[model samples]
Target: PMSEKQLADVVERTVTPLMKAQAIPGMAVAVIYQGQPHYFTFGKADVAANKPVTPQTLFELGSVSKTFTGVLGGDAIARKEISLADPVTKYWPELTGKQWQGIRLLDLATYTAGGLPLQVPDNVTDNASLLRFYQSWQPKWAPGTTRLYANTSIGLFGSLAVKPSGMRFEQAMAERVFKPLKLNHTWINVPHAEESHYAWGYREGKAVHVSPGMLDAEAYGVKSNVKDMASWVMANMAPETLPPSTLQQGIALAQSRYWRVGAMYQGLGWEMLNWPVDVKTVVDGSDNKVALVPVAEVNPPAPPVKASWVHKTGSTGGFGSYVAFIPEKQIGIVMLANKSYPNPVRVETAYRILETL
Candidate 1:
């Protein structure tokens, strides 16, 4: 195992120049290596105030929030409250349509819901309009036959997963997910009390932040600090640390492979693959435009693949985040920054750090 100094050196060398080149205001990182935790923060949380970033500094999670929603939905499935195989119309009847008839909950969670667009229409600015948008939606292809990355699909899946509990998606997640995991600093909406630590984002050297886009809260709304995210990484790395409960089951399912899209093996929310996962696959999967080709689902429930790596990335208008873990290696990493960086930079940096660990 590398000493803490060596790990620190690796992070400093990899991140310092990149942050300078990218003009990132600040970044916070956390790592779980061989069951030990380490954290590092650099740059400024608020460039105007000259406040340095810390483990307690908060940043937007963006699409990485889908990983949490996926696990929460998986918990609902584990409790038999819902099933991936169940039709989406089972929860939101207004979504019923000839084209959507065959779309199942699993298809939404896996981004295979037959060509749902990536963003809500520009005119869909409120809840009522959003509802109408779904009600009038039509799939471009047969459900489960095509892979299209979309927030509309997973956003609805989150809504359905919490319906049986008689709670809103946010409330159910707070109780079933955050409370159980003791994630006090993670939230879809940053509470007023925690507002002091929240960091703003930057675009083109000017302060900018993500607008409240459709399903923004459900799909990419999480704001978290490095410490809380480290605990989250640990849970994904060793789920048994959680007691016998739906949360534990959900964590397991969240990392279990559900579909094969080209070289990408997708889990409930996380992307799964054997350790020493091909760097090319990681790069290709991170591209938003690269269309994924589907493979037939395995039946007779073959033994679950003991996935060595489960990873995810997120980006908003201003901030960026990436997370990945190796179960067998007992290692994981979380990277949060105030300025958006390219996918290649994030993947390559993560690959370099993971190699040393």
Candidate 2:
């Protein structure tokens, strides 16, 4: 392992130039190495005030929220409160339709619930509207036949999984995940006290922020800082280090592989690929616009002995975020920026940083 000074020198030489070239206004990065956390920040978090980014600056997490949703659902499973095999309609009976009847909890969490589009239709303006949309919606393909990464799928999963716990998804996550993990800086809704820490996102040099789309809280609603995210990565890397409980089980299960399509494997919410994975594979899997085809398998294939690496990428209209970690190596990397840089650039930057580690 490199000394703190050496790591700082390498990061300065590499990440500094990347940030400048990408025109990112602000960024915060956290690296977990040798079972310890390190944080670095650059540029202005609040450009007008000239406030610098920090380990405590809050940035929108986008789809990385799914990973937390996954943990919440897995915790339910761990407590035997729900089973992934159970049809989603078991909880939300309002979700009527032949297509929805057969969709399992696992399918939705893995984005394999047939042909859900990337976003809720424009017509779905509220909870009642979304429920009505599901009431009539039909899958283009049978459940589990394809992987169509969509917020609607995981959003439904998050809602259903938390219902049995007697609280909404966000509250359940706060009680079960954030509080237990002591992630005080993480939130689905930023509290008034921490409003000053919220970093304004940008795109095309204009100030922007994350949209609160339907199921936004379930899909991409999390706002967190590098320090909280580092704790998250640590939880993912070693759940056993925490005390025994359902939360530990949930953390462990969230990282378990459930399905595979060639090199791409699906965990509860995280994506897994073999170590030494091609950069293109990581990039394509995380690209929000690219819908990759999956090999048909009704049942999840036998679990692999272990995942070599697990990751997730996220973006709002203005922010871009990426997280990757190797449990065996006890190393993780988190990249959060206010600008929506290209997915490939995000992948390349993390890869370069990880390679040096």
Candidate 3:
């Protein structure tokens, strides 16, 4: 692991330069090794406002929000409030009578519930509506028949964890995870004062007007900055930094290789490289996309995968972020940006940088 000064130098010289070369406007990066936050960035957060990025500058985390929810679930399990094998009916008994009845909480966390399609029907925006939708809609596949990348399923997992904890999901997250870790800069709901610091989400090339935070945070309400997230990376790299039992389960839920998402190996909430050996090169120089063809092109990757790296990617309307950690190296890195770029190459590029280490 690099010392603070050494990591800072690595950032200024290596990582930052790569981001600049890629035309990434503003980025906040936090790197942790051997249980320390060795670097922080506050450069180029908003080009239009000309505001510099800071350690406290908030960006949306997209699906990366699930890791925090997984942590909450782990804490609940450690407390004996819930078990992964418990049916969804345990907390929300109403599920027993509905289409979602037989699904296990673990299945939802793993996104293996009967191939539920992706989309939060507009009517199901709140708790009541969400519950009604789950009860009313018929699942297309048997639970655990396949893995589907569905946000609502993961979101429901987050919502469900709140019940046994006797707190709102967001509140429970704050109490059990954030506050305990002393992570002050992370959150679900953005307060009014921080509104100005909010980076607008973007799609394609246009900014979307919205409060800044990870979309998964919208599910669990995560709002955090780069440095605090670095703390999270360390906790991931060194579970000994947290309560041993909870940390073990939390890391397992988060890091285990669990599902198949097209060509990527999907863990509970994270994604891994599909067998790179099977990767046929993309001709046309479109080096930016995942290899999975539109359903028309091929079936999803076969046999899932054995683990090599455990990582997650996230995006909000205006920001893009990703974190990848190598447990073998006891090193993890986080990248948060106020602009959206959907290219997996960007993530791989960062991985290449880390690979050099």
Candidate 4:
């Protein structure tokens, strides 16, 4: 086994150079091994502005924010304010419509509410509108039948936790989670002083995209630097750092696999590739090098390889990030990219690095 110094050096040397060659403007990577967070940063936060990326450089977390929401939701349940089994309409009774009547709160956490679609209508402006649209929206598939990714829709889990806590999701997360951990660099929205250090987001093609995708903090709005996320990774691997109640909730969310990606299974708010499927990259073994394999490449017509792993990936207008932890190895890797690339580029590169680990 590599010592801490060896591992940290490998990560910095192997990952950063790859980022530069790929034209990835900036990145903040954190690896959690044996319950410790080892981190690194590279490139410019704003290449044009010449702002350098630092440990405090915050970047859009994209869907990684959803996992936070799931945690908060679980906390609400632990506090006896809500239950995952509770129908979503229990809190927002107005949500009791043809579309939402049967959807359980857990269903939202697990993306099993049945055919919510990847996103809502284009005209929908904000959370308020989005919620209203969901109330009126009907399901294309029955709840819990198939596995499909729903971003804006599943974000409601975070919003639902608010009703029970009598606090906004962002506020609850800050008060109940971030503060206790001393994780100051992470927040649902960018603070004014830190705006200079915020890792600016981008998009693909001719259009310059900088907005942090849909700014639903619970789902895609949280921003953090490598340092803060390292704290997060450490907390994830070692729940003992949290209060007993909070730790219980987090474990429930992490251990509660809900969806199927390919050869793995997804836990609450997390997806995985379980079971047998057609995919060349396998999650098994340190040598598989499957970390960067593009999901687009795994859908169908691809061959299958046997592997077992659990991971999460996030992307926004300007950035893409991947985090995979091998429990058996007790090692985790985070890959962050600035300058948006097609999902394929990020996926392929990540897989290459996984092979090294």
What is the lDDT of every predicted structure here? 0.83, 0.83, 0.64, 0.63
lDDT value for candidate 1? 0.83
Q: Residues 1-357, candidate 2, lDDT per residue (tens digit)?
A: 789988777767877888888888989988888888888888988887889998889999998998998888889999999999998889888777777778888888888887787887766788888888778767777777788788888988888888888998889999999999999989999999999999999888888888667788889999999999999989987776899999888876777777777676787788777776777877765555456466445264344334467888889877999898887677889999998887788778787777888
State the lDDT at 152 in candidate 4: 48
For all predicted structures, in order, the TM-scores are 0.95, 0.95, 0.80, 0.81
Q: Which model, 1 or 3, shows the larger TM-score?
A: 1
Weakest 10 consecutive residues of candidate 1 by summed lDDT: 298-307
Q: Report lDDT (Cα) of residue 246, candidate 2.
A: 94
- Poorest 10 consecutive residues by lDDT, candidate 2: 298-307
Q: lDDT tens digits, residues 94-199, model 1?
A: 7766777788898888888877878787678887898888778777678777777788888878878888988988898899888888899998888889887988
Clashing pairs in 1: none
**Model 4 weakest lDDT span, ten residues long:** 285-294
Model 2 TM-score on a 0 to 1 scale: 0.95
Supply the TM-score for candidate 1.
Answer: 0.95
Candidate 4 wrong stretches, greater than 4 Å: 3-9, 126-128, 204-215, 241-243, 273-308, 342-357
Q: After TM-score superposition, what is the CA distance of residue 143 in candidate 3 from its true location, in Å? A: 0.9
